[PDB]
Structure 1
Amino acid sequence: PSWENIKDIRLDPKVHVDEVYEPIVNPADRYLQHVSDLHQYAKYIMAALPKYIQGFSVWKDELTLHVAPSAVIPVTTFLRDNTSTQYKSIIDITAVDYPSRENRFEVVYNFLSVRHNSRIRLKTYATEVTPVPSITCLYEGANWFEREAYDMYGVFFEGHPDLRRIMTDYGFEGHPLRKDFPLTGYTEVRWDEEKRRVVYEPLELTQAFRNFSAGSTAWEPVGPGRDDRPDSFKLPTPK
């Protein structure tokens, strides 16, 4: 009946099992029934708009769509406007380069059907020279996102007010997330005394940067791996 008389917890019997029996399972089975479901949707999408879809792919319930560069707006309307397909909400866009291939950058989109609790991913491609159009005509927040991945890469968004750099130095030249562009950049900053201001002098380090990815196995030691493709949607063998 008072705080002096309260019991402790530090001395009591606790639960004490000798050895827990945790069963082993591959964490992909719980996806599989849905994943084989998802394919039927995805093929449907290609049957829906065959003019603009180069392909679809999926890997562990992440649906990925394959759109030409001059093809973005007619897909994204349909992804917004259909009752069966209403994603309504940009989540994040960015780019990834692959300088090995001819079309250099590829532009990725993420959406979120808040009605139907689903995600969808839209990949296009663009060389640094050529554009991709802006989805700021429909998705209102996306104009901020498109403002981001401009500066990191140089990949454009045609048809876009307020296209300008962000989250970098204003007088910066080049693009950071670009595999030719070095890590420390070109220019460092110090306060010159005599100009009573800071000046932008080219790079000098005390310690040279040391990566350690030079120690690396050529073949990726992960194996080929099994599939989870549905038995409907892989090719039937002859006979």
Structure 2
Amino acid sequence: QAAPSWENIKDIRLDPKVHVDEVYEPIVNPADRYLQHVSDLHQYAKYIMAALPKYIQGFSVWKDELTLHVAPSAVIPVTTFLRDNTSTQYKSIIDITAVDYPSRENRFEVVYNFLSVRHNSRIRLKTYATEVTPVPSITCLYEGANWFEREAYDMYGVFFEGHPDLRRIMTDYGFEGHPLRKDFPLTGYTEVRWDEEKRRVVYEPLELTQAFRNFSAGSTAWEPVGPGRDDR
């Protein structure tokens, strides 16, 4: 068209631009879009349960997504399936990483989010691994893994297995420790750097901060008790 912007043809409008009323945002529903999909997805989890009953543990469905619990010694036969089945044509991984809860004797749950392409459907798959014992990687199945599992190893020390180039990416190259363990805090052990006397040797020390991270240690009565919902 014409009559758009400067070098003006003297034609403009900033008037009569309204829709004056009182709002009518009639809604109450928190999560009801998902309930038919949750009822479908229970049945999908029951299919995955009955199909591979040796290698799987209990499924866990929550709010339009799905998480399969897997015994950690046997993940590779599970993920030869379920990436690559006809009925489960996922073929696209989106996250492998880890979560510590240092409550239990096994310490680091390892969490995988996968993505379908034909089906527009995510999934989650968990193992549990200890700092002591490794669990095998999934780089044998596809090539998108070998970067992420480096990230998992660096943030946790969740040691892996059957994998090429298990380096560090996410820390300093002489830095031991593992940050996303809840063992050592935010400051780190040795984090200083200075270079005056032994010239340019930016060598660490004991990291003595200038004001410590004064925490948040307040907590109210109790959050909520969940209004459960399942298909069955």
TM-score of the aligned structures, taking structure 2 as reference length: 0.90
1:109 is aligned, of 104, 107, 112, to 112
Q: Is the 8 A contact 1:69 1:131 kept in 2?
A: no
C-alpha distance after superposition, 1:168-215 (max 9, x if no partner): 100001100011111110112323222212333323445332343212
Quickly say closer, same or farther: Cα 1:206–1:98, change in 2 above 3 A.
Answer: closer
Quickly say closer, same or farther: Cα 1:152–1:206, change in 2 above 3 A.
Answer: closer
Instruction: Give, in angstroms, the shift of residue 225 of structure 1.
Output: 5.6
Instruction: Give, in angstroms, the shift of residue 73 of structure 1.
Output: 0.5
Matches of 1:116 and 1:106 in 2, distance apart? 27
Q: Is the 8 A contact 2:193 2:202 kept in 1?
A: yes
Instruction: Give, in angstroms, the shift of residue 72 of structure 1.
Output: 0.5
Matches of 1:165 and 1:40 in 2, distance apart? 41
Q: Is the 8 A contact 2:154 2:168 kept in 1?
A: yes
Instruction: Give, in angstroms, the shift of residue 16 of structure 1.
Output: 2.0
Instruction: Give, in angstroms, the shift of residue 150 of structure 1.
Output: 0.3
Computed over aligned residues only, the root mean square deviation of the Cα atoms, in angstroms, reads 2.3
**Farther-moved stretch of structure 1 (12-21 vs 159-168):** 12-21
**Farther-moved stretch of structure 1 (185-194 vs 219-228):** 219-228
C-alpha distance after superposition, 1:39-66 (max 9, x if no partner): 1101100001000111100110110000
Quickly say closer, same or farther: Cα 1:5–1:204, change in 2 above 3 A.
Answer: closer
Matches of 2:227 and 2:49 in 1, distance apart? 28
Q: 2:22 aligned with 1:19, yes or no?
A: yes
Instruction: Give, in angstroms, the shift of residue 23 of structure 1.
Output: 1.1
2:77 is aligned, of 70, 74, 78, to 74
Higher helix content, 1 or 2: 1
Give the secondary structure class of the aligned counterpart of 1:201: coil
Q: Is the 8 A contact 1:110 1:121 kept in 2?
A: yes
Q: Is the 8 A contact 2:151 2:170 kept in 1?
A: yes
Pairing of 1:22-171 with structure 2 (within 5 A): 22-171=25-174
Quickly say closer, same or farther: Cα 1:192–1:142, change in 2 above 3 A.
Answer: same
Quickly say closer, same or farther: Cα 1:226–1:17, change in 2 above 3 A.
Answer: farther
Matches of 1:76 and 1:18 in 2, distance apart? 56
Instruction: Give, in angstroms, the shift of residue 8 of structure 1.
Output: 5.4
Higher strand content, 1 or 2: 1
Matches of 2:62 and 2:227 in 1, distance apart? 14
**Farther-moved stretch of structure 1 (24-33 vs 206-215):** 206-215
Q: Is the 8 A contact 1:89 1:139 kept in 2?
A: no
Number of aligned pairs?
229
| Identical-pair percentage | 100
C-alpha distance after superposition, 1:66-97 (max 9, x if no partner): 00111111110111221100110111111000
**Farther-moved stretch of structure 1 (169-178 vs 1-10):** 1-10
Quickly say closer, same or farther: Cα 1:220–1:228, change in 2 above 3 A.
Answer: farther
Matches of 1:41 and 1:153 in 2, distance apart? 33
Q: Is the 8 A contact 2:189 2:207 kept in 1?
A: no
Unaligned runs of 5+ in 2: none
Give the secondary structure class of the aligned counterpart of 1:79: coil
Q: Is the 8 A contact 1:187 1:200 kept in 2?
A: no
Matches of 2:227 and 2:5 in 1, distance apart? 66
TM-score of the aligned structures, taking structure 1 as reference length: 0.87
Give the secondary structure class of the aligned counterpart of 2:201: strand
Matches of 1:5 and 1:186 in 2, distance apart? 64
Q: Is the 8 A contact 2:69 2:127 kept in 1?
A: yes
Q: Is the 8 A contact 2:83 2:89 kept in 1?
A: yes
Unaligned runs of 5+ in 1: 230-239
Quickly say closer, same or farther: Cα 1:57–1:177, change in 2 above 3 A.
Answer: same
C-alpha distance after superposition, 1:137-185 (max 9, x if no partner): 0021111100110011011221001111112100001100011111110
**Farther-moved stretch of structure 1 (11-20 vs 35-44):** 11-20
